[PDB]
Symmetry: D2
Subunit: 280 residues, 4 copies
């Protein structure tokens, strides 16, 4: 009585994570870009830093050449606007060749001094690229999932919980809360072997406002959200996603979807000015 893998057409072994960490080791320069950017994003998130975190980047990468050019352009503005903004590049995408292409781009961009951001879709793929990640988002459809909250509880970067696909703010405040506590999930070791991951908790989680039924970047949503975070005994630290379905010091970060460029300069220069205006 064949009862196993009845609907599995194929199970091919995946290169162990250590094989991507050996083929593509973090340069000291990548390591510091990742390490400084995390601490930066932390200082901004708790209010220690008056600058704004800016996750901007292509909607999706289809060409690594095209992306390395965007990055070159972005790094200039990253440091040109360094005292008003914290610019991070958003890098969304054979799985083995895919994992190699993914890692090489994140390492090259962090070695060029540009910190990288993306989405933590599952609990196994972080073991391959999170050493080069300074920030990540949990999607609207996986915010209420418990494994995605446990995942963040052990992610080494700050984490953005998006709101519900209807516009629910409670699953995010409950997620942010959950991530702050130790947890246990199941994934693999850097050798690729089924393992138990015991977390210590991530205090650097915050909500993303990405829309829903109708947009929610309105001051009144942000006021309702900020009162929602305060009641739950959380730092009112808010990020607004300008894309997808979308002196106030409770807005600590924005999110932008930008391809190859003119309005990107305009928007970054515009938010720069509003950050400067807030210090007064």
């Amino acid at each position: 009585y064949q009862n196993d893998d009845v609907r599995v057409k194929q199970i091919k072994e995946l290169l162990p994570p250590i094989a991507l960490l050996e083929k593509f080791p973090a340069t000291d320069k990548a390591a510091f870009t990742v390490h400084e950017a995390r601490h930066a994003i932390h200082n901004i998130l708790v209010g220690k830093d008056d600058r704004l975190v800016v996750v901007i980047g292509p909607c999706s990468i289809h060409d690594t050449k095209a992306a390395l050019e965007y990055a070159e352009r972005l790094k200039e503005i990253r440091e040109e606007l360094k005292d008003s903004l914290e610019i991070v590049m958003r890098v969304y995408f054979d799985i083995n060749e895919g994992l190699r292409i993914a890692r090489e781009l994140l390492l090259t961009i962090n070695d060029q001094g540009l910190p990288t951001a993306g989405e933590f879709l599952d609990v196994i793929s972080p073991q391959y690229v999170a050493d080069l990640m300074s920030w990540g988002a949990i999607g609207a459809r996986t915010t209420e999932s418990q494994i995605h909250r446990e995942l963040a509880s052990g992610l080494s970067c700050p984490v953005g919980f998006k709101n519900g696909t209807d516009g629910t703010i409670k699953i995010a405040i409950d997620a942010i809360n959950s991530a702050r506590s130790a947890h246990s999930f199941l994934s693999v070791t850097k050798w690729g072997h089924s393992a138990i991951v015991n977390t210590s908790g991530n205090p650097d989680c915050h909500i993303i406002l990405r829309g829903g039924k109708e947009p929610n970047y309105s001051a009144e949503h942000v006021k309702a959200v900020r009162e929602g975070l305060i009641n739950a005994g959380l730092i009112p630290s808010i990020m607004i996603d300008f894309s997808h379905a979308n002196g106030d010091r409770s807005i600590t970060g924005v999110m932008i979807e930008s391809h190859l460029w003119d309005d990107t300069e305009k928007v970054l220069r515009q938010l720069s000015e509003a950050v400067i205006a807030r210090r007064n």
Copy 2:
């Protein structure tokens, strides 16, 4: 700079899945009980069998002995009401001793002729006991997750996608629509090794009514769900979870001839064992009644 496992307190290697299947191989009775039960649930779901899948069991297992005595009791009712209710037991609970204790119980129960049911919450644990699984539920907090639908696409058992914690039914209709297609998710091999899982599609995916802001077992919800499934081009095979936010009707719906209700979910010894006999006997009578229309 230390940028790795900064928020990891420990990463301990887990027994490979093959080591649970070696320590506890399926008997031919388990093997048979799993295969027959899964085929039965399919026929009941797609309207070839007029019986009703009853997923009943304790809300939580704290003792293995107590659960083995419940299984013995429920097996007797399963054999009696076999021409009205395909009865399946709900089995919800060191991870290695937890995997050992969970596998042994599911084998023992299937080797006793009682098919077992559970909840698939991750993409790794299935590899340890799915061979002993005849049905499974996908929770309300993981029904819009693409990973949990792609898991169901490659699950060898019939799958139940619960509604949302509010009452959303589309996540599940979309879930059922998704599972029916080939997908790909990352999991481990039976040797415990990171892998690419290419699926084929599970056509045996269905909706569960677990309640929400307000219970949804009423005939109209069932009619709505039927119409919502009908509009998505999906068979209106519906299951109502008498428990959860639907407890904090169905029988007469069936007595009157609702063929859409094809399954139920009960949380018993959470009722005690006497009401369990009553409710199974009640629904048995309702399925008998449904055939005379």
Copy 3:
């Protein structure tokens, strides 16, 4: 094109991890204590603290486990009867590797759980991870005794080990083997989870020569006198094991008597013997006889 890899490999198949073998066939408290007490007892005999002789006796090859488990029951009674004179351990040598490993463990678990200690041979660095927890003694054959890799396997083996003389009668390869094993080494093998690993060793002081014949036999009082002088000149404890079979015999029964006379004369250097015995290679009747004979030769040694 230009296939440069696995050109002469017909198939590579993943073998169960050692953990799947120790999980399906876990040691029992009775099996654990038999291995522990035999390994301690074999050590005390090899060092002179025990006057008893080690007796590694068992079938030439195991094709049937019922036949092996019946020999196990018979041999156990003789182990219990001659316990004050002999340390009897069964030789479990067999000819799907995955099933062969399942069959081998279940056999060693059953025999050690019945209270009979098991002895075998180490031919590889990987197979020990599946069955050595049930091994109270083991051997390094004459064709692997000059191989450092095995000397490093013996350096990290939890059982006392026996190195065999050259297939030509060469003693140096094993006096050198014992010296190497006494040291900490490092050999590549797998974990209990089946993963390529580096094994760091502490050294095994419980390694000893097995006389098994090379060109002509080597069991006479003269070969032992000169093998013992060779261990003494090299600073090694003079503990010797004579295999009555293989080359020393072609008669196991004639070698038994020559060795029994040596023990009766007072040779405390012979601390162990090896016999190849089946039930239906001597038979059960001659096994009782050789065992009862060596027991009386140990009792005689005590008095001289």
Copy 4:
């Protein structure tokens, strides 16, 4: 009752062989070098090529920069003496994870520079990390009688050399050559680092190395007695003389070269290969040029008698 790992101080996981082939992927240049060399060595071992195989290299590699300079000089000699000699460099090493990285990066660079590499197979696991870069390999005198070794040779993608015993025993190698030609089985690790069963198809390209013993074994008389030894056994009389080790115990390895060069000139087609231990600063670089040029001239002379 601690019955496990009582004599094990530490067991650490070694990198999967795949982490080494990913970080140090073979180049199309390394691949063609290994491929054409394994095939050139085979044609010389069976008489299809009148050239001689030369396994020459340092005794011990403690510096890659010193080896890479030796590789550069040697390659020019390989290209100059190509019509008379199949020159291959011997790469023998004295954190195993770092030593794996150093070993493979070196064998990759040298095969990428077009110089085929030659080493020794000590165990059944290490191969999986660098054998894709080996054009020849050896089994030493202390493991030639070992089944596990002859089963690994049965499934090696390169021609293999079995050394005689440390007493000078030829049979074990005639028995080693025989066994290796048969299909066998051994337990090793996959390219993913996992416990495995390796089924072999057998290796016809295996031969004897005369490395020494109680006294040397390179005289015309030993080769004659060794070649008759192989003939009886029904085996291609294809012999390899190791000038070093116990055949020369520098100044003697050069006497062994003249002794051997004289037998080849005579016409001994049964000598298909030599082994020389050479360093820069073990003979020096100047003697290496000389001995390669010597053996080249003897091979040239062999074609005329």
